[PDB]
Design a protein around this nucleic acid. Structure first.
Ligand code: GCP
Ligand code: MG
Ligand code: MG
Ligand code: MG
Ligand code: MG
Ligand code: MG
Ligand code: MG
Ligand code: MG
Ligand code: MG
Ligand code: MG
Ligand code: MG
Ligand code: MG
Ligand code: MG
Ligand code: MG
Ligand code: MG
Ligand code: MG
Ligand code: MG
Ligand code: MG
Ligand code: MG
Ligand code: MG
Ligand code: MG
Ligand code: MG
Ligand code: MG
Ligand code: MG
Ligand code: MG
Ligand code: MG
Ligand code: MG
Ligand code: MG
Ligand code: MG
Ligand code: MG
Ligand code: MG
Ligand code: MG
Ligand code: MG
Ligand code: MG
Ligand code: MG
Ligand code: MG
Ligand code: MG
Ligand code: MG
Ligand code: MG
Ligand code: MG
Ligand code: MG
Ligand code: MG
Ligand code: MG
Ligand code: MG
Ligand code: MG
Ligand code: MG
Ligand code: MG
Ligand code: MG
Ligand code: MG
Ligand code: MG
Ligand code: MG
Ligand code: MG
Ligand code: MG
Ligand code: MG
Ligand code: MG
Ligand code: MG
Ligand code: MG
Ligand code: MG
Ligand code: MG
Ligand code: MG
Ligand code: MG
Ligand code: MG
Ligand code: MG
Ligand code: MG
Ligand code: MG
Ligand code: MG
Ligand code: MG
Length: 197
RNA sequence: GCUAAACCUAGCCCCAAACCCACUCCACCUUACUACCAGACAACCUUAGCCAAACCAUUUACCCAAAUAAAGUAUAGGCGAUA
RNA sequence: ACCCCUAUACCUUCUGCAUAAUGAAUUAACUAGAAAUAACUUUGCAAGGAGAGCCAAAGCUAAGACCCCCGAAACCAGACGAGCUACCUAAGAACAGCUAAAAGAGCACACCCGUCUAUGUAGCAAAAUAGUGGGAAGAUUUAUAGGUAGAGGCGACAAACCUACCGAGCCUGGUGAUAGCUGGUUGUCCAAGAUAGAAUCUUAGUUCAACUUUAAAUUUGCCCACAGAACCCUCUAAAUCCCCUUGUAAAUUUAACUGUUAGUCCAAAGAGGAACAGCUCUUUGGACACUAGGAAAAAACCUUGUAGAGAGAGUAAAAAAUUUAACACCCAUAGUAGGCCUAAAAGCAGCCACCAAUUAAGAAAGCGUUCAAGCUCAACACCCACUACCUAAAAAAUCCCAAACAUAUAACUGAACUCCUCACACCCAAUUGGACCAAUCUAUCACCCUAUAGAAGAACUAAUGUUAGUAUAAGUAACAUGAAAACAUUCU
RNA sequence: GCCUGUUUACCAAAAACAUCACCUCUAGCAUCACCAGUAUUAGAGGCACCGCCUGCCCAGUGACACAUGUUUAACGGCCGCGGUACCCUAACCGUGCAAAGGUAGCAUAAUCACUUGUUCCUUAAAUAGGGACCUGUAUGAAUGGCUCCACGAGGGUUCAGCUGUCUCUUACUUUUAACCAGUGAAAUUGACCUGCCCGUGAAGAGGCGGGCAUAACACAGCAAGACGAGAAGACCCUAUGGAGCU
RNA sequence: ACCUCGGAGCAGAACCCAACCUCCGAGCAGUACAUGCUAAGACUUCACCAGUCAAAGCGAACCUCAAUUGAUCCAAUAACUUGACCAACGGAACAAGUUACCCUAGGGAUAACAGCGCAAUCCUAUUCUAGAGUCCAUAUCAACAAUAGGGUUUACGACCUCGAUGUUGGAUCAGGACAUCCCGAUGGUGCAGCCGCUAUUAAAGGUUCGUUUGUUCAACGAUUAAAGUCCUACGUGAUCUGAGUUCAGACCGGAGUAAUCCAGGUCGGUUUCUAUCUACUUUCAAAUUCCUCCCUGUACGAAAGGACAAGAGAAAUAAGGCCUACUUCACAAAGCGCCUUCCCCCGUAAAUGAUAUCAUCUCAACUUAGUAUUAUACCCACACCCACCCAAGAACAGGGUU
């Protein structure tokens, strides 16, 4: 039982058209985005700051949840969503809040929408683990999109150069993507262990 | 000592000289070796290519009037291999 | 006879083969250097030679001597093929039984095909057998005859079939096609004999250079001493060129040719790489592809070269030495719980200061304390071994690897090197030069097998070479005949 | 893949080829084919019954018209950047290019890779299988797109049934096999009087170096080695060597 | 990527010298028109072709630069002269792509698998004490560095092999190394006990069954004392499989006008050998491991929790045998059935005592744990042999025939 690695390339002939630092910076940006989604949304407490998700289609186009109205703080077991007496907006927010990933249990009675959430020591933790897994899958999808963009750029820049250099660059991009996948899996496992601990 | 080994002579080759052959009886172009019946149609045509030019694309002696010489000369030829 | 000491079969391709790189079971027979211009030698004649033609400022004529074999996929021309198979034409034949819904329907025989498995693989068979399968009244199968043929035929397109091997059939002919590629290239002995590169549809080849070989003319050839061979920045080496003597004996030029020109290791100066490789590329030198001795067997490391017999001798190179860590005994009272800073920080959290009491102890060098307290060390008192040659070792896979020996005087052993008696041409790849030579025929001799000359189908340990004989595998794989009997018959 | 059927005789029977259905193009015609036929016909083709459909383009090529044209069920093609409100998307706007900018449908597929895409069912365990989502940045409509009746020696998954496939093999018969009697091959063979360990060597030794072992000889098995035998590697490279095809 | 020419370094002081070695440049330009004609002697890019300098002489006034370039034939012209990025630049007058339908002659001169050389990469062991570990370098880890060892992996070289070294996994059989996963025995601990961490010694024995992917790798389920690493031509295909991976058919996406192709996916796709030589074909035997009860609910703690040691009993695997029960079966052979199975192993822990009058376990002389063995069980009768039988057996051999 013994693992194995590879090597790494760094020269100017590659930088003459494709910079290997831009893909690393984009991967680090995706890492930071996932870390922000983990440490900003739902951790242990609901928090009024976790309502920054995505809304449904309103007048052809999806918007946010906090930029439309405002979220105030009153009691630790109630989240009042005061708005501006708009008809379709309340129903849109109720529909966009209901199948999120965390069980909000909303009670709408006209304008004031309260979100009371107690504390569950098992089901809520499992729902949070599932939401973190969905966020990790979204980060993986974004990483795959970045990988496809980089591969399209490398395919656009390969006709006037040898095939060995293109193969080495493809192998290095695959190694970077594998390292990013390993880091995403490590973060997901740490978050799951913290939630189920 | 067994298997074995050995033989000369049938014939053949290259020339000279000289021009050379073919129904005993019957059968033999239809399914040849078939004795015996009505659409008769009928042949005349530049060789090519391998190969050499170190590839290959024009090109490359072979052609049927005795010898020797002129002479491998005049000539021809991606004026080149070569003729 | 064996036992004892020595010894890594041959050819070919290679830098290098015992290589586990190729070829070969053996025997007999057969099977591979054909020729010109120009040069050399020997005659003849001679400013002329020649038996017309042609050459000629010593030439002309004659003779001798000299340039291999087998092997492709391919191309073209003309014949021969549809008795197998692809399709078509003519006139035929076959399809039990059941359910039949009516049917390019269902189960299922005969028949056609061949999904899967197993046996077989020089087998029964150059495509089978046994089981299991699809179709089986149709776009079915099949008996006979005919037709479409290769720059093509045919094709429900598999680039499928066209007489067992069709990306283009087979036979004959051009054809002894060609091949820079592989393999082979047959008597004895002797001598000389290792190459800077350039060009190239060219790096698997060739030409010219370089080396080598033969035959000639001529005189200088090599080693070398004073002198000498710009510079500039920082250094600037081992060295190199020219070169009188001197030891030497070779060098230059002319004529005619082949062959080498796909190389390795070591020492040194370098470049690339990893200041890696039995790694790649230059330069200087050496060795090998040539004998022998040594380092275990070993190409390139050391000694050594010119050839034989000897049951003589002196020698060259030639045997690896190291074994390692001890350490001190004793005594610690005090201004003072030095000041600052710190809740506290007392010799030892952080700084400034580091004075000073007793014959001796630093305003504290290591710990230790939350702060203190306790442990030492630096200092007397006390005797005083040395109080230190610094450090500098490790494990892989079948089984360690000659046996051993610390103590009778430095010498001995050890080659194809050298000497000794004798005779001496008698140990390199490709290539070149030379002296001989068996069989055969012819001219003349010879007459129990030879001689002088001319000639050539003129020599086989080797080409998965051809034919024939016999071995090894091997007396091996494999192959047979149902039983009794009166040999009338009977039984399974 | 609609079905029956057809094919690589001798390693591939299939999802491949054909097939009824649909569509495009060509042709106004007499004696040897097509045809002793005449535009509801004949030939050259694509696709593949049926059911719903088959979106846009003649810029280029080709074809037809020679009136700059007509033709895509002809060859073929169906966009790019930025501003876009707390999140992936965005209705929207600005802008360039074009012939048009992928329409309906379906969808991680037999569909480059990322890919074990995400999720539910199935198993104790599911990179296997089935149902849902679409960044399919290389899906998509006679290069036909999508459902469906029947069928398939086509390719995958699976409930129940019990079968030596297995846990774990055992017994019996025949063939085979060993001996006896008869006949009697083939590949292979440099010569061999043909051992083991370590090391060396053209780098993997029965033949070399150092040790060990060692009377001769039949017969039956096994396959670790002889870099084992058949086929001058079929993979890689060279040849101013061939051939097929476009 | 490059193909021709020039300058510098490698190449330091006559000449020369390569590299897919390191840097610059060139395919021109500018001024006179004697940039006229002839002619000794020389240099020469290692050949040749080309290229370079030039005394004197006839005439006439009183050349810069470094490369700056192109042979023959042929064509234009009355002539003198002229004509190519013939740049593949010593230059064919004019010719591309694909072949997995492929063929031939060769090459280990040259690749893919193996072996071999190296160790860039990888792994491991020691040295210094930064820094973690509350203080505390060394219970444990280890930053920058240093010294060595190994040849699992990825690469490098092309040294044997292309007149063929069969290639990945899996099955059977395993041999070996220890750098030890478990069973044995010790030192230390940030060791109160159970679990643990680290180090030394120890290779006699063992190291599971299943789902998915063809997998070796990898994820998961249930276990176990453990489900160890590595080598053996990434062990073993003349013992077996071909699941993928190395053809000919075909489909999808893409590239290409097309043939055709993809280190893209998928369905299908012939595994031939009668053993000549070496080696071998019962070594006759001295097995391991888990679990249950007692101790004990004790030692230990504050409680939870919780041991060693001694003893007893049951098992599992492995080896060697057997047919009385059961079972396949039946005057036999077998397991699913039954019986038996016995010695250690050395790293340290301690007395006396010098070198060094203390002390000190001793590569000081010496004394203990400390050596199981100089182990015992099998088997060991030289010839009656036609023939018959046999629990003996291929033939042979062996036993009985009273
Ligand atoms: O409240 P509690 O949680 O139950 C503590 P408790 O019950 O302790 P107790 O009395 O149950 O004791 C526990 C064990 O102690 C044993 N014991 C008591 N007396 C004696 C023993 N054991 C002896 N060996 N010897 C005695 O004399 C009991 O057996 C029990 O098991 O108070
Ligand atoms: Mg030719
Ligand atoms: Mg030639
Ligand atoms: Mg040798
Ligand atoms: Mg050869
Ligand atoms: Mg060689
Ligand atoms: Mg040999
Ligand atoms: Mg060879
Ligand atoms: Mg042979
Ligand atoms: Mg016929
Ligand atoms: Mg029918
Ligand atoms: Mg039927
Ligand atoms: Mg047909
Ligand atoms: Mg086809
Ligand atoms: Mg020839
Ligand atoms: Mg000589
Ligand atoms: Mg060549
Ligand atoms: Mg070398
Ligand atoms: Mg104190
Ligand atoms: Mg001597
Ligand atoms: Mg001598
Ligand atoms: Mg002859
Ligand atoms: Mg002869
Ligand atoms: Mg002979
Ligand atoms: Mg042979
Ligand atoms: Mg022969
Ligand atoms: Mg017999
Ligand atoms: Mg035999
Ligand atoms: Mg037999
Ligand atoms: Mg019979
Ligand atoms: Mg079908
Ligand atoms: Mg077939
Ligand atoms: Mg057929
Ligand atoms: Mg078949
Ligand atoms: Mg079809
Ligand atoms: Mg359309
Ligand atoms: Mg895909
Ligand atoms: Mg399965
Ligand atoms: Mg069918
Ligand atoms: Mg060896
Ligand atoms: Mg041998
Ligand atoms: Mg072989
Ligand atoms: Mg060959
Ligand atoms: Mg060439
Ligand atoms: Mg050619
Ligand atoms: Mg040709
Ligand atoms: Mg042809
Ligand atoms: Mg010269
Ligand atoms: Mg002058
Ligand atoms: Mg050229
Ligand atoms: Mg050139
Ligand atoms: Mg194909
Ligand atoms: Mg094909
Ligand atoms: Mg070949
Ligand atoms: Mg080689
Ligand atoms: Mg290798
Ligand atoms: Mg610290
Ligand atoms: Mg080399
Ligand atoms: Mg080979
Ligand atoms: Mg061989
Ligand atoms: Mg150990
Ligand atoms: Mg293997
Ligand atoms: Mg084998
Ligand atoms: Mg099949
Ligand atoms: Mg086999
Ligand atoms: Mg042998
Ligand atoms: Mg208790």
């Amino acid at each position: 039982g013994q693992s194995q690695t590879r090597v790494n390339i760094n020269a100017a002939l590659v930088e003459d058209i494709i910079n290997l630092e831009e893909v690393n910076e984009e991967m680090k940006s995706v890492i930071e985005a996932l870390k922000d989604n983990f440490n900003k949304t739902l951790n242990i407490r609901t928090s009024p700051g976790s309502l920054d998700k995505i809304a449904v289609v309103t007048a052809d186009g999806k918007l946010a949840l906090n930029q439309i109205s405002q979220i105030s703080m009153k009691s630790p077991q109630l989240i009042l969503v005061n708005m501006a007496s708009f008809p379709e907006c309340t129903a849109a927010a109720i529909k966009a809040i209901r199948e999120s990933g965390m069980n909000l249990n909303p009670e709408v009675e006209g304008t004031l929408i309260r979100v009371p959430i107690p504390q569950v020591t098992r089901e809520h933790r499992e729902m949070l683990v599932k939401l973190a897994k969905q966020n990790t899958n979204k980060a993986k999808d974004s990483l795959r999109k970045v990988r496809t963009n980089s591969m399209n750029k490398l395919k656009k820049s390969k006709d006037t150069v040898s095939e060995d250099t293109i193969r080495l660059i493809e192998k290095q991009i695959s190694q970077m993507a594998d390292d990013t996948v390993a880091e995403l899996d490590r973060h997901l496992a740490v978050k799951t262990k913290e939630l189920l601990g």
